[PDB]
């Protein structure tokens, strides 16, 4: 009955108006991808070819879009539909000869998705704002949503058959907003506790405690292979802390290279003497606690979860409140 049809749960009141089954979206398992920036996701090829932005054809891109349509459907860098000016849509599976299609300014091609796009990645028990943050895709061969380890802590996932959803903003007006108000780089300091939500997590902390310790010394071959992995380098090797006996650089020195610009922070390592601060040897620290970072160069001390992680006054938080958003993202990726 009409009263029955517009009734309650599942009625046109709730099931069809407030929450509906949105399109241009996909869900799949999330497996680890450390070699991805904190703002990248790696959509599987099928999902990327099964969803599409719409690119208004324009004098600048008319050239590429001609090839995408010609190669549409047959290959991953292809276009599927060419919506036209009067609104018709020349679906390209059936246009008999895709090669001859004539694109014009004002006509829009549904290019299959591709590296560089923006997508809102969300976990299913959504609760905090950190649940739906935007990532830039980077299409990869296998069928899994590839996520960076640092962004897992705000999402609250762990990769054990967990499943996450990818919603693709489909117009240039929305891409601007996802890009400017919710990109993982712009949501590190939550308003709930004024603390950075994401911090260096699993293996990267157990490594930072040991790269940045007092007894670590890396030789020349190792420093160059390691510094090619920094995307903030100005290209100049630093001067090795120990020189004449042989040239051996110190871990702290090559961690002072990932650190961005100039920041002043002083914190305590997880193992801290309860009496050293008061007595002698206060500033020479027998056990290398008392991280001091002056001018952007760790001058002393081992790094722990409190120093590098998700707490107020963390080395990551000093950066967000002074240096910035993109620089902080680059520093996180390089550290990892």
């Amino acid at each position: 009955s009409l009263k029955q049809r517009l009734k309650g749960k599942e009625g046109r009141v709730r099931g069809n108006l407030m929450g509906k089954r949105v399109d241009f979206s996909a869900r799949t398992v999330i497996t680890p991808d450390p070699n991805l920036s904190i703002d990248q996701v790696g959509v599987p090829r099928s999902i990327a070819a099964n969803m599409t932005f719409a690119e208004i054809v324009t004098p600048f891109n008319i050239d590429r879009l001609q090839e995408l349509v010609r190669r549409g459907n047959s290959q991953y860098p292809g276009a599927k539909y060419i919506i036209r000016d009067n609104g018709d849509r020349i679906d390209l599976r059936f246009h008999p000869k895709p090669s001859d299609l004539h694109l014009q300014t004002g006509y829009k091609v549904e290019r299959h998705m591709c590296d560089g796009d923006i997508v809102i990645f969300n976990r299913q028990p959504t609760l905090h704002k950190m649940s739906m943050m935007g990532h830039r895709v980077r299409i990869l061969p296998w069928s899994t949503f590839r996520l960076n380890l640092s962004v897992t802590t705000p999402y609250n996932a762990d990769f054990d058959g967990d499943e996450m959803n990818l919603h693709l903003p489909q117009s240039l007006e929305t891409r601007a907003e996802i890009q400017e108000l919710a990109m993982v780089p712009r949501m590190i300091v939550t308003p709930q506790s004024n603390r950075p939500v994401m911090g260096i997590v699993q293996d990267t902390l157990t490594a930072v405690r040991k790269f940045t310790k007092r007894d670590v010394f890396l030789e020349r071959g190792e420093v160059m292979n390691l510094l090619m992995f920094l995307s903030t380098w100005d290209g100049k090797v630093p001067q090795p802390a120990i020189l004449k006996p042989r040239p051996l650089w110190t871990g702290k020195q090559i961690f002072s290279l990932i650190i961005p610009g100039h920041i002043n922070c002083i914190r305590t390592h997880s193992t801290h003497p309860d009496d050293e601060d008061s007595g002698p040897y206060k500033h020479i620290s027998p056990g290398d606690t008392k991280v001091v970072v002056e001018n952007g160069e760790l001058i002393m001390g081992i790094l722990c979860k409190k120093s590098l992680g998700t707490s107020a006054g963390s080395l990551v938080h000093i950066s967000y409140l002074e240096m910035g958003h993109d620089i902080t993202r680059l520093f996180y990726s390089n550290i990892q």
Partner: protein
């Protein structure tokens, strides 16, 4: 292996495994439950270590070379049954190869595999747009109602049985076999409570190698063991090594008293390994000895049924239900995810109105309806004669166009049958 008559049984969703192996470390009471007859996994040279990073957060790295020599290969049988129905007084669902000559609705597809009877033969390779069973109902010319598979079955059919059903009709069962090699995403799990999907797979050459050549087929992360304290997985890792070098199934009955960690270790020491299991590995890409000595060993691994292919769902311009015009599901799992209220509310918090408008309206139900301005009732809008008229108000000059969700137009139309008359007044 489910039961040993897998070949004649034909249940839906049943997966055998290529090489089930009895565990090297066995509880004494497993024999009682037929486990050296129906094992559920393969002993894997597992190595608890942190390598490239793809192993963090319950993820196992895996050897592309070993999943290529058969380690965990499996077949996913899925049975499909169609029953001939004679319900109609004149309507018979007979079994036949529909042909364009006599059936009006032959749909767009390859109907050339169905043989004469109507059933695809065993041994073919069904694919998308192929029609597995063909039936031509007879209307009072002969609409063909035929069966199409869904998406990615792509499995050579293994058996097609044709036989009388309990109802007395004639029915058929087709088991469409599909092979499943381990990939990136498939759950694998040990017997001690640790479950983990694969994160990258790497080939034998670019993996850590022992100094006698033994590259680990699984590299579980070290961080997982602590907080959860499964210090029985690491003991069975030691005993399995002792058992492998001494050639005997090693018993690990819950309480044996003959297995303190120390006693199992001293046996391993004779064979020549670190008394406590560690071995010296070397980085595969560079060759340099990984400083810390990795703990490696043999541990039983069970391959969970859950697979990424079943979980994966994707949608875009997908089939829509005509009645409510909000997305539905056709082939390919094109029913998309749902923007439910919880995630309709982080979006308000981020402040992003346009995404919310796009996800909620444009994405699911974009409709434009021509509305009269003086009265807010809807308006006939002929498109070909380009006239717009609100009968009952006699207006042809003021018919505005308002975009509204289709789900809402029907609330507005339905409310009118009940006589409430919302005016979508634009002013």
């Amino acid at each position: 292996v489910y039961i040993t008559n897998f070949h004649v049984r034909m249940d839906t969703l049943a997966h055998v495994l290529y090489y089930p192996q009895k565990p090297l470390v066995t509880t004494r009471s497993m024999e009682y439950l037929r486990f050296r007859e129906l094992p559920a996994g393969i002993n894997s040279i597992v190595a608890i270590a942190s390598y490239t990073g793809y192993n963090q957060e319950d993820s196992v790295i895996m050897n592309r070379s070993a999943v290529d020599r058969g380690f965990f290969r499996s077949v996913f049988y899925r049975s499909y049954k169609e029953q001939e129905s004679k319900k109609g007084f004149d309507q018979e669902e007979v079994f036949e190869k529909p042909t364009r000559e006599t059936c009006q609705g032959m749909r767009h597809a390859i109907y050339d595999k169905l043989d004469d009877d109507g059933l695809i033969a065993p041994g073919v390779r069904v694919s998308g747009d192929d029609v597995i069973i063909g039936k031509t109902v007879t209307l009072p010319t002969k609409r063909d109602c035929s069966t199409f598979l869904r998406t990615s079955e792509t499995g050579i059919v293994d058996q097609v049985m044709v036989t009388l059903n309990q109802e007395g009709y004639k029915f058929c069962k087709i088991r469409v076999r599909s092979v499943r090699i381990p990939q990136i995403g498939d759950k694998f799990a040990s017997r001690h409570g640790q479950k983990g999907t694969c994160g990258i797979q790497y080939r034998q050459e670019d993996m850590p190698f022992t100094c006698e050549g033994i590259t680990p087929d699984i590299i579980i992360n070290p961080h997982a063991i602590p907080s959860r304290m499964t210090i029985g997985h690491l003991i069975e890792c030691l005993q399995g090594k002792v058992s492998a070098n001494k050639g005997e199934i090693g018993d690990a009955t819950p309480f044996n008293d003959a297995v303190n960690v120390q006693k199992i270790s001293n046996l391993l020491s004779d064979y020549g390994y670190h008394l406590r299991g560690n071995e010296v590995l070397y980085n595969g890409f560079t060759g340099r000895k990984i400083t810390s000595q990795i703990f490696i060993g043999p541990t039983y691994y069970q391959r969970l049924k859950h697979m990424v292919d079943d979980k994966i769902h994707s949608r875009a311009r997908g089939p829509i239900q005509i009645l409510n015009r909000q997305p539905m599901e056709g082939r390919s799992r094109d029913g998309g995810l749902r923007f439910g209220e919880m995630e309709r509310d982080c979006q308000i918090a981020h402040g992003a109105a346009q995404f919310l408008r796009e996800r909620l309206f444009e994405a699911s139900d974009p409709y434009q309806v021509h509305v009269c301005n003086l009265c807010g009732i809807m308006a006939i809008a002929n498109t070909r004669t380009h006239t717009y008229e609100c009968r009952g108000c006699r207006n042809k000059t003021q018919i505005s166009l308002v975009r509204m969700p289709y789900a809402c137009k029907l609330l507005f139309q339905e409310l009118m049958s009940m006589s409430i008359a919302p005016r979508m007044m634009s002013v």
